[PDB]
Design a protein around this motif. Structure first.
Motif, PDB file in Angstrom:
ATOM      1  N   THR A  12       0.510  39.861  10.679  1.00  0.00           N
ATOM      2  CA  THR A  12      -0.467  40.431   9.754  1.00  0.00           C
ATOM      3  C   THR A  12      -0.928  41.809  10.211  1.00  0.00           C
ATOM      4  N   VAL A  13      -1.126  41.985  11.516  1.00  0.00           N
ATOM      5  CA  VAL A  13      -1.722  43.217  12.028  1.00  0.00           C
ATOM      6  C   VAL A  13      -0.701  44.350  12.046  1.00  0.00           C
ATOM      7  N   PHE A  14       0.424  44.150  12.736  1.00  0.00           N
ATOM      8  CA  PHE A  14       1.314  45.255  13.076  1.00  0.00           C
ATOM      9  C   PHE A  14       2.542  45.371  12.180  1.00  0.00           C
ATOM     10  N   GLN A  15       2.869  44.339  11.408  1.00  0.00           N
ATOM     11  CA  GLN A  15       3.950  44.394  10.423  1.00  0.00           C
ATOM     12  C   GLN A  15       5.242  44.929  11.044  1.00  0.00           C
ATOM     13  N   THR A  16       5.695  44.239  12.087  1.00  0.00           N
ATOM     14  CA  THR A  16       6.959  44.541  12.741  1.00  0.00           C
ATOM     15  C   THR A  16       7.944  43.404  12.504  1.00  0.00           C
ATOM     16  N   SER A  17       9.233  43.725  12.634  1.00  0.00           N
ATOM     17  CA  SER A  17      10.262  42.703  12.473  1.00  0.00           C
ATOM     18  C   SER A  17      10.134  41.612  13.527  1.00  0.00           C
ATOM     19  N   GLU A  18       9.676  41.966  14.729  1.00  0.00           N
ATOM     20  CA  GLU A  18       9.594  40.989  15.809  1.00  0.00           C
ATOM     21  C   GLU A  18       8.442  40.017  15.581  1.00  0.00           C
ATOM     22  N   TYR A  39       4.494  31.048  16.262  1.00  0.00           N
ATOM     23  CA  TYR A  39       5.279  32.030  15.530  1.00  0.00           C
ATOM     24  C   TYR A  39       6.342  31.282  14.734  1.00  0.00           C
ATOM     25  N   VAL A  40       7.101  32.029  13.928  1.00  0.00           N
ATOM     26  CA  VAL A  40       8.034  31.409  12.987  1.00  0.00           C
ATOM     27  C   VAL A  40       9.000  30.486  13.725  1.00  0.00           C
ATOM     28  N   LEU A  41       9.764  31.038  14.666  1.00  0.00           N
ATOM     29  CA  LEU A  41      10.777  30.272  15.382  1.00  0.00           C
ATOM     30  C   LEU A  41      10.211  29.491  16.559  1.00  0.00           C
ATOM     31  N   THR A  46       6.101  36.446  21.775  1.00  0.00           N
ATOM     32  CA  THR A  46       5.479  37.690  22.193  1.00  0.00           C
ATOM     33  C   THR A  46       4.214  37.395  22.995  1.00  0.00           C
ATOM     34  N   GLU A  47       3.599  38.466  23.506  1.00  0.00           N
ATOM     35  CA  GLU A  47       2.339  38.337  24.230  1.00  0.00           C
ATOM     36  C   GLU A  47       1.256  37.705  23.363  1.00  0.00           C
ATOM     37  N   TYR A  48       1.306  37.929  22.048  1.00  0.00           N
ATOM     38  CA  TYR A  48       0.269  37.419  21.158  1.00  0.00           C
ATOM     39  C   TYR A  48       0.499  35.955  20.788  1.00  0.00           C
ATOM     40  N   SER A  49       1.743  35.567  20.501  1.00  0.00           N
ATOM     41  CA  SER A  49       2.004  34.175  20.153  1.00  0.00           C
ATOM     42  C   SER A  49       1.720  33.251  21.327  1.00  0.00           C
ATOM     43  N   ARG A  50       1.928  33.729  22.555  1.00  0.00           N
ATOM     44  CA  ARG A  50       1.630  32.905  23.720  1.00  0.00           C
ATOM     45  C   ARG A  50       0.136  32.643  23.845  1.00  0.00           C
ATOM     46  N   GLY A  65      15.478  37.165  11.248  1.00  0.00           N
ATOM     47  CA  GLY A  65      15.851  35.775  11.448  1.00  0.00           C
ATOM     48  C   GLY A  65      15.820  35.356  12.902  1.00  0.00           C
ATOM     49  N   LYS A  66      16.014  36.302  13.816  1.00  0.00           N
ATOM     50  CA  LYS A  66      15.900  36.059  15.245  1.00  0.00           C
ATOM     51  C   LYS A  66      14.684  36.791  15.793  1.00  0.00           C
ATOM     52  N   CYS A  67      13.917  36.095  16.623  1.00  0.00           N
ATOM     53  CA  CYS A  67      12.741  36.664  17.263  1.00  0.00           C
ATOM     54  C   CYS A  67      12.320  35.726  18.378  1.00  0.00           C
TER      55      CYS A  67
END
Ligand code: NA
Length: 207
Positions: free
Chosen positions: A150-156, A183-185, A167-171, A162-164
């Protein structure tokens, strides 16, 4: 299926229930501290979501706004809500099995427990103080903790290719609420229940 939506928070919340393109039962309602809301979800509902909205102001026609989880300014939601929103996600009657989970993929605003009111499976909860510990870059002024997509709107962060990876935030969300999607995956934290089970959603389950 029968869902019971309980508000154990000390503050008022406005509950919502939508499957993206249509409301679930009445779509939304005001839940004072301690009030319960019983709804009926048609069997086979795929992709339904229940969430809470905070600090709302509605007119007589049901139009207004909420600081978190707003669903187009309506009291009775026909559409998912604006992040950050703790999500109670469910698919019902999928080859004799219900599937439930809690998701922080769209942020976090209100502590939540999602448990079945019948037998055959377990429940999931995310009751940590994610808002209190939220990183500064993810804090939402209206309240709640935004997800990195929502914040940074990056592919990662949004996992668009489809692959990711984590990240520091999802942890952060995962460290506090392991039983929820970060996160998605993310490794599925989904619970499998018998088809046609019933459930109770409790906001602020430990307070
Ligand atoms: Na999700």
């Amino acid at each position: 299926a029968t869902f019971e939506i309980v508000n154990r928070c000390s503050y008022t919340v406005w509950a919502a229930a939508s499957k993206g393109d249509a409301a679930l039962d009445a779509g939304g309602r005001q839940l004072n501290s301690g009030e319960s809301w019983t709804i009926n979800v048609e069997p086979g509902t795929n992709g339904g979501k229940i969430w809470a909205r905070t600090d709302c102001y509605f007119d007589d026609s049901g139009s207004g706004i909420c600081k978190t989880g707003d669903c187009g300014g309506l009291l009775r939601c026909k559409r998912f809500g604006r992040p950050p929103t703790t999500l109670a996600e469910f698919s019902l009657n999928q080859y004799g099995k219900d599937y439930i989970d809690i998701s922080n993929i769209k942020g976090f605003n209100v502590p939540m427990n999602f448990s079945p009111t019948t037998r055959g499976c377990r429940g999931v909860r995310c009751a940590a103080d994610i808002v209190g510990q939220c990183p500064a870059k993810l804090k939402a002024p209206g309240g709640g903790c935004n997800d990195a997509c929502t914040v940074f709107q990056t592919s990662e962060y949004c996992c668009t290719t489809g692959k990711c990876g984590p990240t520091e935030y999802s942890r952060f969300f995962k460290r506090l609420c392991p039983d929820a999607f970060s996160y998605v995956l993310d490794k599925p934290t989904t619970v499998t229940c018998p088809g046609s089970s019933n459930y109770r959603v409790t906001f602020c389950p430990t307070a």
